[PDB]
Design an enzyme around this catalytic site. Structure first.
Site, PDB file in Angstrom:
ATOM      1  N   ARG A 157     -10.794  -0.554  11.916  1.00 53.38           N
ATOM      2  CA  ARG A 157     -10.989  -1.144  10.601  1.00 53.38           C
ATOM      3  C   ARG A 157     -10.229  -0.346   9.549  1.00 53.38           C
ATOM      4  O   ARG A 157     -10.053   0.869   9.668  1.00 53.38           O
ATOM      5  CB  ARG A 157     -12.477  -1.209  10.246  1.00 53.38           C
ATOM      6  CG  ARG A 157     -13.274  -2.187  11.107  1.00 53.38           C
ATOM      7  CD  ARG A 157     -14.735  -1.765  11.236  1.00 53.38           C
ATOM      8  NE  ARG A 157     -15.542  -2.109  10.066  1.00 53.38           N
ATOM      9  CZ  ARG A 157     -16.447  -3.086  10.040  1.00 53.38           C
ATOM     10  NH1 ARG A 157     -16.670  -3.818  11.124  1.00 53.38           N
ATOM     11  NH2 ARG A 157     -17.137  -3.327   8.933  1.00 53.38           N
ATOM     12  N   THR A 158      -9.771  -1.050   8.518  1.00 50.13           N
ATOM     13  CA  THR A 158      -9.054  -0.448   7.401  1.00 50.13           C
ATOM     14  C   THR A 158      -9.236  -1.373   6.208  1.00 50.13           C
ATOM     15  O   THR A 158      -9.336  -2.587   6.368  1.00 50.13           O
ATOM     16  CB  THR A 158      -7.562  -0.241   7.720  1.00 50.13           C
ATOM     17  OG1 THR A 158      -6.934   0.497   6.664  1.00 50.13           O
ATOM     18  CG2 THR A 158      -6.840  -1.581   7.880  1.00 50.13           C
ATOM     19  N   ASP A 184       4.798   1.253   1.887  1.00 56.07           N
ATOM     20  CA  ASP A 184       3.947   0.860   2.996  1.00 56.07           C
ATOM     21  C   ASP A 184       3.616  -0.616   2.801  1.00 56.07           C
ATOM     22  O   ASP A 184       2.998  -0.991   1.803  1.00 56.07           O
ATOM     23  CB  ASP A 184       2.719   1.765   3.054  1.00 56.07           C
ATOM     24  CG  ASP A 184       3.089   3.247   2.994  1.00 56.07           C
ATOM     25  OD1 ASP A 184       4.116   3.638   3.595  1.00 56.07           O
ATOM     26  OD2 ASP A 184       2.358   4.026   2.350  1.00 56.07           O
ATOM     27  N   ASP A 231       7.250   1.202   5.857  1.00 56.33           N
ATOM     28  CA  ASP A 231       6.240   1.224   6.904  1.00 56.33           C
ATOM     29  C   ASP A 231       5.604  -0.156   6.943  1.00 56.33           C
ATOM     30  O   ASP A 231       5.148  -0.661   5.913  1.00 56.33           O
ATOM     31  CB  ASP A 231       5.200   2.317   6.640  1.00 56.33           C
ATOM     32  CG  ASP A 231       4.337   2.607   7.853  1.00 56.33           C
ATOM     33  OD1 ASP A 231       4.830   3.273   8.790  1.00 56.33           O
ATOM     34  OD2 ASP A 231       3.166   2.169   7.868  1.00 56.33           O
ATOM     35  N   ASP A 274       8.821   6.161  -0.036  1.00 52.36           N
ATOM     36  CA  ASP A 274       8.133   5.388   0.994  1.00 52.36           C
ATOM     37  C   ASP A 274       7.538   4.108   0.421  1.00 52.36           C
ATOM     38  O   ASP A 274       6.903   4.126  -0.638  1.00 52.36           O
ATOM     39  CB  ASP A 274       6.987   6.194   1.613  1.00 52.36           C
ATOM     40  CG  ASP A 274       7.457   7.398   2.391  1.00 52.36           C
ATOM     41  OD1 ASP A 274       8.510   7.316   3.057  1.00 52.36           O
ATOM     42  OD2 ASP A 274       6.761   8.432   2.338  1.00 52.36           O
ATOM     43  N   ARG A 279       0.036   3.006  -5.689  1.00 55.74           N
ATOM     44  CA  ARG A 279      -1.098   3.510  -6.454  1.00 55.74           C
ATOM     45  C   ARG A 279      -0.679   4.446  -7.584  1.00 55.74           C
ATOM     46  O   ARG A 279      -1.543   4.910  -8.335  1.00 55.74           O
ATOM     47  CB  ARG A 279      -2.101   4.207  -5.521  1.00 55.74           C
ATOM     48  CG  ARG A 279      -2.797   3.258  -4.533  1.00 55.74           C
ATOM     49  CD  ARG A 279      -3.963   3.931  -3.799  1.00 55.74           C
ATOM     50  NE  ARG A 279      -3.592   5.268  -3.352  1.00 55.74           N
ATOM     51  CZ  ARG A 279      -2.926   5.512  -2.232  1.00 55.74           C
ATOM     52  NH1 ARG A 279      -2.584   4.511  -1.436  1.00 55.74           N
ATOM     53  NH2 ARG A 279      -2.601   6.753  -1.901  1.00 55.74           N
ATOM     54  N   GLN A 323       0.856  -1.162   0.000  1.00 55.91           N
ATOM     55  CA  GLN A 323       0.000   0.000   0.000  1.00 55.91           C
ATOM     56  C   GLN A 323       0.907   1.231   0.000  1.00 55.91           C
ATOM     57  O   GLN A 323       2.132   1.157   0.239  1.00 55.91           O
ATOM     58  CB  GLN A 323      -0.985  -0.016   1.192  1.00 55.91           C
ATOM     59  CG  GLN A 323      -0.397   0.478   2.515  1.00 55.91           C
ATOM     60  CD  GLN A 323      -1.425   0.655   3.624  1.00 55.91           C
ATOM     61  OE1 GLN A 323      -2.628   0.593   3.391  1.00 55.91           O
ATOM     62  NE2 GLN A 323      -0.944   0.888   4.841  1.00 55.91           N
TER      63      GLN A 323
HETATM   64  N1  LIG Z   1      -7.111   9.973   6.300  1.00 46.16           N
HETATM   65  C1  LIG Z   1      -7.041   8.707   5.822  1.00 46.16           C
HETATM   66  N2  LIG Z   1      -8.168   7.975   5.643  1.00 46.16           N
HETATM   67  C2  LIG Z   1      -8.136   6.712   5.176  1.00 46.16           C
HETATM   68  N3  LIG Z   1      -7.003   6.069   4.849  1.00 46.16           N
HETATM   69  C3  LIG Z   1      -5.802   6.684   4.981  1.00 46.16           C
HETATM   70  C4  LIG Z   1      -5.742   8.068   5.483  1.00 46.16           C
HETATM   71  N4  LIG Z   1      -4.436   8.411   5.505  1.00 46.16           N
HETATM   72  C5  LIG Z   1      -3.726   7.340   5.057  1.00 46.16           C
HETATM   73  N5  LIG Z   1      -4.545   6.315   4.741  1.00 46.16           N
HETATM   74  C6  LIG Z   1      -4.149   4.978   4.235  1.00 46.16           C
HETATM   75  C7  LIG Z   1      -3.856   4.984   2.743  1.00 46.16           C
HETATM   76  C8  LIG Z   1      -2.639   4.084   2.613  1.00 46.16           C
HETATM   77  C9  LIG Z   1      -2.016   4.006   3.998  1.00 46.16           C
HETATM   78  C10 LIG Z   1      -0.737   4.833   4.067  1.00 46.16           C
HETATM   79  O1  LIG Z   1      -1.089   6.197   3.829  1.00 46.16           O
HETATM   80  P1  LIG Z   1      -0.001   7.385   3.835  1.00 46.16           P
HETATM   81  O2  LIG Z   1      -0.208   8.253   5.053  1.00 46.16           O
HETATM   82  O3  LIG Z   1       1.352   6.754   3.584  1.00 46.16           O
HETATM   83  O4  LIG Z   1      -0.482   8.257   2.559  1.00 46.16           O
HETATM   84  P2  LIG Z   1      -0.036   7.999   1.024  1.00 46.16           P
HETATM   85  O5  LIG Z   1      -1.288   7.853   0.194  1.00 46.16           O
HETATM   86  O6  LIG Z   1       0.996   6.898   0.914  1.00 46.16           O
HETATM   87  O7  LIG Z   1       0.585   9.437   0.637  1.00 46.16           O
HETATM   88  P3  LIG Z   1       2.089   9.921   0.976  1.00 46.16           P
HETATM   89  O8  LIG Z   1       1.865  11.063   1.939  1.00 46.16           O
HETATM   90  O9  LIG Z   1       2.819   8.742   1.586  1.00 46.16           O
HETATM   91  O10 LIG Z   1       2.620  10.340  -0.374  1.00 46.16           O
HETATM   92  O11 LIG Z   1      -2.965   4.552   4.915  1.00 46.16           O
HETATM   93 MG   LIG Z   2       2.653   6.515   1.979  1.00 51.34          MG
END
Ligand SMILES: Nc1ncnc2c1ncn2[C@H]1CC[C@@H](COP(=O)(O)OP(=O)(O)OP(=O)(O)O)O1
Ligand SMILES: [Mg+2]
Ligand SMILES: [Mg+2]
EC number: 2.7.7.-
Length: 344
Positions: free
Chosen positions: A193-194, A71, A121, A69, A56, A51
């Site tokens: 939940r996720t 995940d 992560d 990063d 994505r 993830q």
């Molecule tokens: N507010 C939220 N609501 C739902 N899911 C969430 C969330 N924030 C994160 N997730 C989920 C989505 C995937 C997982 C990791 O999210 P990262 O914080 O790593 O955000 P990423 O999309 O990777 O953006 P980056 O800042 O890293 O460029 O947690």
């Molecule tokens: Mg991320």
């Protein structure tokens, strides 16, 4: 003008480089291989999958000392009703101490591992179901579509379906939509939940409905925010910003320029009421509809962001409407900076 080739060059300039992409793949591959072969964890680890915005294909190039990063989600068969989130996570500490001594730290919902070329992560999760439904879910989580090492833009044929192989469609919603995983929250000391697979699936589908432009529009808006960060609130960023963009973008996008103007105009009109209320919108997470993606965003930060979008949208509209290549590209560069090229 739409300046499609200039947008193509801009996007090439703001994607993670090939070196960073290889570093992402190598760090993830090594972590997942080590987990797979670690004997004390074989009876509890069902699978692992990627993830993150790199998975994505919505991530932008890291700048400076920042590293890409990864995940990693670990799917376990632990019983979340009988084991605390802290104990579940503690089961993984000997692994981290063996392979990443001095480079890992405990976080609220995950472990962080810091290497020199990548940040990892590690999210520990459990399947709440039991019996035959648990077995069906585990067969989904062990499929090629979940285990994939490729990013979204590298395999357009990807679907969330245990039969997919690198044309099948996404599995029916009844098989996965109401089946989130649970994940520790140490600061709340509870299982939440996720549903990352539902988010990934939604992202891929939206990108197909938008002719490949969705993930590139996410990257472009993230780049705009980075270039104008002193004029914008710190939040929204990351996934909440991605989610706002995916909400504003209509299906059927035909070009970057058109899609930018459309999503900004829709953002501005859709949320005008809540902006005038000095409030913020609720947006449900894909997969866990009871969760507000914007939960942590303040109304003040949302309203500042909205004003930033209104300002940007005026420029973007004049950039699209301009009939001169150099004027259009100069307006686009006023939005995105020097990574957007002038036409030769
Ligand atoms: N507010 C939220 N609501 C739902 N899911 C969430 C969330 N924030 C994160 N997730 C989920 C989505 C995937 C997982 C990791 O999210 P990262 O914080 O790593 O955000 P990423 O999309 O990777 O953006 P980056 O800042 O890293 O460029 O947690
Ligand atoms: Mg991320
Ligand atoms: Mg929409």
């Amino acid at each position: 003008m739409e300046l499609q080739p200039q947008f193509n060059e801009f996007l090439a300039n703001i994607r993670p480089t090939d070196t960073q992409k290889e570093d992402w793949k190598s760090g993830a591959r090594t972590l997942r291989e080590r987990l797979k072969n670690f004997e004390p964890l074989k009876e509890i680890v069902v699978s692992t999958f990627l993830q993150g915005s790199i998975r994505r294909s919505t991530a932008i190039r890291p700048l400076g000392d920042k590293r890409p990063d990864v995940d990693i989600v670990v799917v376990t068969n632990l019983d979340h009703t009988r084991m605390s989130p802290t104990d579940a996570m503690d089961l993984f500490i000997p692994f981290l101490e063996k392979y990443y001594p001095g480079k890992w730290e405990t976080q609220g919902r995950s472990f962080g591992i810091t290497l020199s070329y990548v940040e990892l992560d590690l999210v520990i999760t459990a399947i709440p179901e039991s019996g035959a439904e648990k077995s069906h879910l585990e067969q989904l989580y062990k499929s090629e579509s979940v285990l994939t090492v490729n990013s979204l833009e590298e395999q357009t044929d990807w679907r969330l379906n245990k039969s997919w192989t690198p044309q099948v469609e996404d599995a029916p919603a009844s098989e996965w939509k109401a089946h989130p995983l649970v994940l520790p929250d140490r600061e709340k000391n509870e299982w939440g939940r996720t549903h990352p697979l539902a988010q990934i699936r939604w992202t891929a589908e939206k990108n197909r409905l938008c002719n490949g432009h969705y993930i590139n529009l996410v990257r472009a808006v993230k780049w705009w925010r980075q270039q104008n960060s002193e004029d914008l609130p710190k939040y929204p960023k990351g996934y909440p910003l991605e989610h706002l963009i995916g909400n504003a973008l209509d299906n059927g996008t035909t070009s970057m320029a058109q899609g930018l103007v459309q999503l900004m105009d829709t953002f501005l009109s859709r949320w005008a009421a809540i902006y005038n209320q000095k409030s913020k919108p609720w947006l449900s997470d894909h997969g866990v509809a009871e969760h507000d993606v914007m939960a942590r965003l303040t109304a003040e930060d949302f309203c500042s962001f909205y004003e930033g979008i209104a300002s940007a949208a005026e420029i973007a509209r004049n950039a699209l409407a301009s009939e001169e290549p150099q004027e259009s590209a100069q307006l686009w560069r006023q939005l995105f900076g020097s990574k957007f090229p002038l036409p030769g």
